[PDB]
């Protein structure tokens, strides 16, 4: 039945690829020729955030477009206002260890995790006036490798272990799981309706999920290596995912396979983040060479180089009004472009 | 108000500044290992649904913070990055002979990443009673699972521990040579490897890894200091 | 998607020889270094042979060095084992592993339990 049961896999697996041959009727090269080029897209360091000592493994911007939390490998995740550098918080962790951490789109708490298993979350608007964990939401049985708010009290996060989670903050327990990659999710993303988000593991497939259903809409692969970083294309019917193989692929949802695919025979290092400007028009993309490229999302022709990083550029966000892109770096520095 | 926000500047960054003392101070150590190997032991020595357990110890006055990883999957390729800027890794082997190939690939794997490139590696060969014990029993044969043991033959400058048994010499001298030419076929002399024979009933694992850690400060400063 | 199909193997005598083969598909097979693991019944996943991208430098498990040749085939996207002098331990399941990132000399996680870039494998019995 083992042999059967495989043979049906191929047999499905057959008709899923022939379908989208029939449905790549043309490349987006093809239509994209017809517009012009982005041109030189060259971006000065507006700010750069001295305080961390150590790796920067993850930073996100505040929905304000003001404030943002940095997370750092030396226990500490500092909460930032990059107008004026000032540090608002600097929140002492329990695990030296994190690899991911989140801003509440309300402003009021933030999240973090990692090696622990554990997403902590800290209510920032506390009385005592010093933040303090909220809650501790345990039941991975992996490192935690990424984390977003939908609101105060739900959460979904990414695990080492091959499974997703949404979790209930106020009683803290998995509300669902989502289960079906085969190695580390690295990465993920919420829609901008927050109905369905993307992740991408350690194997070729990105897998879209409905957070109210509770299963895998649609699979896609295309890459050849792990997929270390993924973003929401701005309208939500398409999502950018850089990998291991130093390559980024855009691919649709509606179309259900790879759009396009941005490299250069000379990049040879594999992508840790990226992400879309306000428009959509341009991707950024963090490599482990420490020099951001930021691509023509249309034509797929590298249009600029970020290259003020001294050590891997680990995280990559651009601000929700689309003023700023702060990256950071195992130099433990963040600089903020513009 | 801008100067009350300046005020909660200057306050955090006072409380940076007093704890980036405390993490200059303290030294980082990542302990790896197989299920076979006595890690846990070793970590036991050292009389002062979790993904990662911290020991804290001391020794001469320093401080060393040592990492073991507790629930996570088999793939390590991904949570291990996390590690690239540790003092040193501690590799705890199990030395009776087999995974004694196994580890030699993961101790390979370990040396060769594009991340614990710069990390130097404290070597544990553990257990050695146990090979001792079964070396004399002859029952297990190494040129089995290492053909070109059949060949080697100890070092005429070896060191042996008075009273041991030759065979037990040539065995112990040729797993640690196996896993020094995984340590010299690369690197570039940036990083070193400490081998060391330990079993779980010695005492001075920690005086080992203080001696070797502070080997790895001298090397880093002679570097830093532009005399290497 | 990334794909290994191990073309050979099957039933031999004591003493025999066979040729493994695997085809890969799905990625570019001349950046990604490769490697022969095996199963035997009862026993963990086993490390046997490792070849780089250029095939210059290779590396076998002591147990099998002598007797297993790997060699690759960059053109046709190829990954051959040619075992000689089968010992009725040799029985196993074979699996072509690829190195987790291309352009690296690090192949951490061939040999796990889960690996997204391991075959199916091709049965190895010897009588």
């Known amino acids: 039945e083992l042999d059967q049961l495989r043979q049906e896999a191929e047999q499905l697996k057959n008709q899923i690829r022939d379908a989208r041959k029939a449905c790549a009727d043309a490349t987006l090269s093809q239509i994209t020729n017809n517009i012009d080029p982005v041109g030189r897209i060259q971006m000065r360091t507006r700010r750069t955030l001295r305080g961390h000592l150590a790796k920067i493994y993850a930073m996100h911007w505040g929905t304000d477009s003001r404030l943002l939390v940095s997370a750092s490998q030396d226990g500490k995740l500092i909460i930032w206002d990059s107008y004026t550098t000032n540090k608002v918080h600097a929140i002492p962790l329990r695990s030296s260890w994190v690899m991911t951490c989140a801003y509440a789109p309300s402003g009021n708490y933030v999240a973090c995790g990692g090696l622990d298993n554990i997403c902590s979350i800290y209510n920032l608007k506390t009385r005592e006036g010093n933040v303090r964990v909220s809650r501790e939401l345990a039941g991975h049985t992996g490192y935690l490798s990424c984390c977003r708010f939908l609101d105060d009290n739900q959460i979904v996060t990414s695990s080492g272990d091959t499974t997703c989670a949404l979790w209930d903050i106020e009683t803290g327990q998995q509300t669902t799981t989502f289960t079906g990659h085969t190695g580390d999710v690295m990465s993920l993303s919420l829609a901008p309706d927050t109905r369905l988000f993307v992740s991408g593991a350690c194997d070729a497939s990105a897998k879209l999920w409905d957070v109210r259903e509770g299963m895998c809409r649609q699979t896609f692969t295309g890459h050849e290596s792990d997929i270390n970083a993924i973003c929401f294309f701005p309208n939500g019917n398409a999502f950018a995912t850089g990998s291991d193989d130093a390559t980024c692929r855009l691919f649709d949802l509606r179309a259900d396979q790879e759009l396009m695919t941005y490299s250069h025979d000379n990049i040879i290092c594999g992508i840790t983040s990226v992400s879309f400007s306000k428009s959509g028009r341009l991707l950024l993309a963090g490599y482990d060479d420490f020099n951001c490229n930021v691509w023509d999302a249309l034509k797929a022709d590298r249009a600029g180089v970020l290259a003020g990083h001294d050590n891997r550029v680990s995280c990559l966000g651009v601000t929700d009004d689309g003023m700023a892109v702060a990256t950071g770096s195992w130099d433990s520095f963040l600089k903020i472009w513009n | 108000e801008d100067k009350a926000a300046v005020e909660r500047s200057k306050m955090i960054e006072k409380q940076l500044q007093k704890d980036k003392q405390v993490y200059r101070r303290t030294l980082r150590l990542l302990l790896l290992g197989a299920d076979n190997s006595g890690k846990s032991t070793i970590v036991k020595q050292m009389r002062i649904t979790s993904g990662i357990f911290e020991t804290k110890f001391q020794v001469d006055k320093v401080n060393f913070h040592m990492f073991d990883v507790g629930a996570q999957r088999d793939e390590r390729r991904k949570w291990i990055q996390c590690f690239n800027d540790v003092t040193a890794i501690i590799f705890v082997v199990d030395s009776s002979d087999n995974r004694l190939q196994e580890a030699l690939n993961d101790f390979d794997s370990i040396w060769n990443n594009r991340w614990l490139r710069t990390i130097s590696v404290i070597l544990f060969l553990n257990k050695q009673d146990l090979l001792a014990e079964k070396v004399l029993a002859g029952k297990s044969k190494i040129e089995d699972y290492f053909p070109e043991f059949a060949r080697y033959t100890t070092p005429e400058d070896a060191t042996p521990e008075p009273g041991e048994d030759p065979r037990v010499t040539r065995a112990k001298y040729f797993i640690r040579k196996e896993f020094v030419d995984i340590s010299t076929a690369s690197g570039d002399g940036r990083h070193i490897c400490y081998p060391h024979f330990t079993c779980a009933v010695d005492t001075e694992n920690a005086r080992r890894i203080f001696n070797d850690c502070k080997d790895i400060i001298l090397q880093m400063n002679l570097r830093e200091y532009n005399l290497v | 998607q990334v794909q290994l199909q191990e073309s050979g193997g099957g039933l031999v005598q004591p003493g025999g020889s066979l040729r493994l083969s695997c085809a890969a598909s799905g990625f570019t097979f001349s950046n990604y270094k490769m490697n022969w693991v095996r199963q035997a019944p009862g026993k963990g996943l086993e490390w046997v042979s490792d070849?780089?991208?250029?095939?210059?430098?290779?590396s076998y498990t002591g147990s099998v060095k002598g007797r297993f040749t790997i060699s690759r085939d960059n053109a046709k996207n190829t990954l051959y084992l040619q075992m000689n002098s089968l010992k009725p331990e040799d029985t196993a399941v074979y699996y072509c592993?690829?190195?987790?990132?291309?352009?690296?000399?690090?192949?951490?996680?061939?040999?796990?339990?889960?690996?997204?870039?391991r075959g199916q494998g091709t049965q190895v019995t010897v009588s």
């Open positions: 070849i780089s991208q250029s095939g210059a430098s290779i």
């Open positions: 592993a690829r190195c987790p990132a291309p352009f690296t000399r690090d192949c951490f996680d061939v040999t796990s339990t889960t690996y997204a870039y």
